[PDB]
Ligand binder design. Structure first.
Ligand SMILES: CCCCCCCCCCCCCC(=O)O
Ligand SMILES: CCCCCCCCCCCCCC(=O)O
Ligand SMILES: CCCCCCCCCCCCCC(=O)O
Ligand SMILES: CCCCCCCCCCCCCC(=O)O
Ligand SMILES: CCCCCCCCCCCCCC(=O)O
Ligand SMILES: CCCCCCCCCCCCCC(=O)O
Ligand SMILES: [Ru+3]
Ligand SMILES: [Ru+3]
Length: 582
């Protein structure tokens, strides 16, 4: 186009343009106040209207990176608050924009965004609605810089739907709090999911990411031919390559072009895209990525007719090992939408290792005749782990299930810090809360997706604090081996039990008057130090104690005398559990 700003101002809208421009300058100017960005956003949008009224006005034909970088150097505090980033303004445009992406700080040093009371949020949301959503959007963007700016706009529109519906209701906290926590746990999961694909691209190479894209696209698009899925995997690998680079316009255009090809080839990809392709350009890439798995033709035959019993299997493989193996991922994923994508890569590696061993023998057909028999143990292993834990989640509650995990995983790796073991077991319990509530045809894709972000969060906290060698080995291993590595952990026999500290196992009358979240944290934090003090404690002993602690809380909180009860009964509970866990 003759003017980049005029075009993007048209096919996005003025309300969407000012929002993205705010997120743009918030991720680069993470130290300027909110009033400065509003000054810049209003100066940019007023300039954008000049190019809409005339495509040949002052500096309208310039590039967006030039207009973005020109505004980036207008700030006077650029030399003081960022300093080194101000040096980028002395380079040419193809390097200046590259200079700005490097000096972007991933993890700044800002306070946490404290969630205030519902009354003060519904008053600010009602008094001045626009600046309320923009300020908090400016606070999320300045703390998550590499977050995809358009996708961050999709969450802000969801928050707006939570206030308009709940801030005029009965107990607004009953309407809003289960929604803000939903949007937080989902928003933090999206921030960690896209950050994981960048690590998996530079650690496992370009080939490993393509195998993952082959298995998920063919799973999502079973009616698509292998040539069409292979074409999409190449474009998909290019998108996440340049989106992880840090550039917004470079990543926004690649995703927009990919969505246009998918919408122009719905007859050879999927039939579920009618609704997604109706949406405008901003929502195309987001809708398509979350489209439901299409139905398989159901008339598909077995895989032994082309990969086992057929002739020239070693010939079709040796001619192109990556093309032949990718078909095995294609032909197996679209016939198993219930398998996790990581599980399908585990089967293809089994098929890959078998062909490299059988085709080097005298009689190949007799060798790999049992290649499909090796898949059943690898497939039953995650299915049985889903069955064991979901049945445990059916008996116990969600809270009682978290404690079962908190005891099981503390005895395996007792060296991990207590606050880490708590947040892990509670986030891990949230996985079974919604994945076990799905049928068996969706349990493994659910568990794979949430375990991927929870296990990676564990490895992030363990990377900045080396604690256990067994945890480091599982965090360093491959993608198909990461989750089985954690499931293969056993009880640490070399662990010396931690010395007793009475201050930890002392409880005061404040737990009678804490929120349900704070109460569950303290009951579980004390359960970790209880196991770390006596790791060889059997479960029947822990059925007690925890029941003696249940009566200890009901005896002190309900009595007319508090604080004093925690001193008398607190000594009885501790000392009785001393001889109970002998
Ligand atoms: C993403 C952009 C969200 C803008 C609206 C935020 C509303 C919630 C305000 C902070 C409360 C919280 O931390 O959850
Ligand atoms: C002057 C700052 C400009 C910041 C970027 C404004 C235009 C963003 C366009 C985003 C298009 C998204 C396409 C897509 O993901 O489907
Ligand atoms: C042109 C399409 C190429 C698709 C290549 C897929 C190859 C998958 C082989 C199995 C990979 C298992 C993971 C690994 O070996 O690290
Ligand atoms: C629910 C809690 C986790 C239960 C086991 C999850 C199994 C994940 C299967 C996907 C995989 O690791 O290959
Ligand atoms: C701290 C917890 C480290 C282990 C994470 C386990 C993730 C889910 C594995 C399921 C299983 O135990 O079989
Ligand atoms: C030897 C120290 C004894 C006192 C500490 C015991 C800690 C028990 C924690 C119980 C947590 C679960 C409570 C519940 O079921 O709601
Ligand atoms: Ru965050
Ligand atoms: Ru993606």
């Amino acid at each position: 186009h003759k003017s980049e700003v005029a075009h993007r101002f048209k096919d996005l809208g003025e309300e969407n343009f000012k929002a993205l421009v705010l997120i743009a300058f918030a991720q680069y100017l993470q130290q300027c106040p909110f009033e400065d960005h509003v000054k810049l956003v209003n100066e940019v949008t007023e300039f954008a209207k000049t190019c809409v009224a005339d495509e040949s006005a002052e500096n309208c034909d310039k590039s967006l990176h030039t207009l973005f970088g020109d505004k980036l150097c207008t700030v006077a505090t650029l030399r003081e608050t960022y300093g080194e980033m101000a040096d980028c303004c002395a380079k040419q445009e193809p390097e200046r924009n590259e200079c700005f992406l490097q000096h972007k700080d991933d993890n700044p040093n800002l306070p946490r965004l404290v969630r205030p009371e519902v009354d003060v949020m519904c008053t600010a949301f009602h008094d001045n609605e626009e600046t309320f959503l923009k300020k908090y959007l400016y606070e999320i963007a300045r703390r998550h810089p590499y977050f995809y700016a358009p996708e961050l706009l999709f969450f802000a529109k969801r928050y707006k739907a939570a206030f308009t519906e709940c801030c005029q209701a009965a107990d607004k906290a009953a309407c809003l709090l289960p929604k803000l926590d939903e949007l937080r746990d989902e928003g933090k999961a999206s921030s960690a999911k896209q950050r994981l694909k960048c690590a998996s691209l530079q650690k496992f190479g370009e080939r490993a990411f393509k195998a993952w894209a082959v298995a998920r696209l063919s799973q999502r698009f079973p009616k698509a031919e292998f040539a069409e899925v292979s074409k999409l995997v190449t474009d998909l690998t290019k998108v996440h390559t340049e989106c992880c680079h840090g550039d917004l316009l470079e990543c926004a255009d690649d995703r927009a072009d990919l969505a246009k090809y998918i919408c122009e080839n719905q007859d050879s990809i999927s039939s579920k895209l009618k609704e997604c392709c109706e949406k405008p350009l901003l929502e195309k890439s987001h809708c398509i990525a979350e489209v439901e798995n299409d139905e398989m033709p159901a008339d598909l035959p077995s895989l032994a007719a082309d990969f086992v019993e057929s002739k020239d299997v070693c010939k079709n493989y040796a001619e192109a090992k990556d093309v032949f193996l990718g078909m095995f991922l294609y032909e197996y994923a679209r016939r198993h939408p219930d398998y996790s994508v990581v599980l399908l890569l585990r089967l293809a590696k089994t098929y890959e290792t078998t062909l490299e061993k059988c085709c080097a023998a005298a009689d190949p057909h007799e060798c790999y005749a049992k290649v499909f028999d090796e898949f059943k143990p690898l497939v039953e292993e995650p299915q049985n782990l889903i069955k064991q834990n979901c049945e445990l989640f059916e008996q116990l509650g969600e809270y009682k299930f978290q404690n079962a995990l908190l005891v099981r995983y503390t005895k395996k790796v007792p060296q991990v810090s207590t606050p880490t073991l708590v947040e892990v077991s509670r986030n891990l319990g949230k996985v079974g809360s919604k994945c076990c509530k799905h049928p068996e045809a969706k349990r493994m894709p659910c568990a794979e997706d949430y375990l991927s972000v929870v296990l990676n969060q564990l490895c992030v906290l363990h990377e900045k604090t080396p604690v256990s060698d067994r945890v480091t080995k599982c965090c360093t291993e491959s993608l198909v081996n990461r989750r089985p590595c954690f499931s293969a952990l056993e009880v640490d026999e070399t662990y010396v039990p931690k010395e007793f500290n009475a201050e930890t196992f002392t409880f005061h009358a404040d737990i009678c008057t804490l929120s349900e979240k704070e109460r569950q944290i303290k009951k579980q934090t004390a359960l970790v130090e209880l196991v770390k003090h006596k790791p060889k404690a059997t479960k029947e002993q822990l059925k007690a104690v925890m029941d003696d602690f249940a009566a200890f809380v009901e005896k002190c909180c309900k009595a007319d005398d508090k604080e004093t009860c925690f001193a008398e009964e607190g000594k009885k509970l501790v000392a009785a559990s001393q001889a109970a866990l002998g």
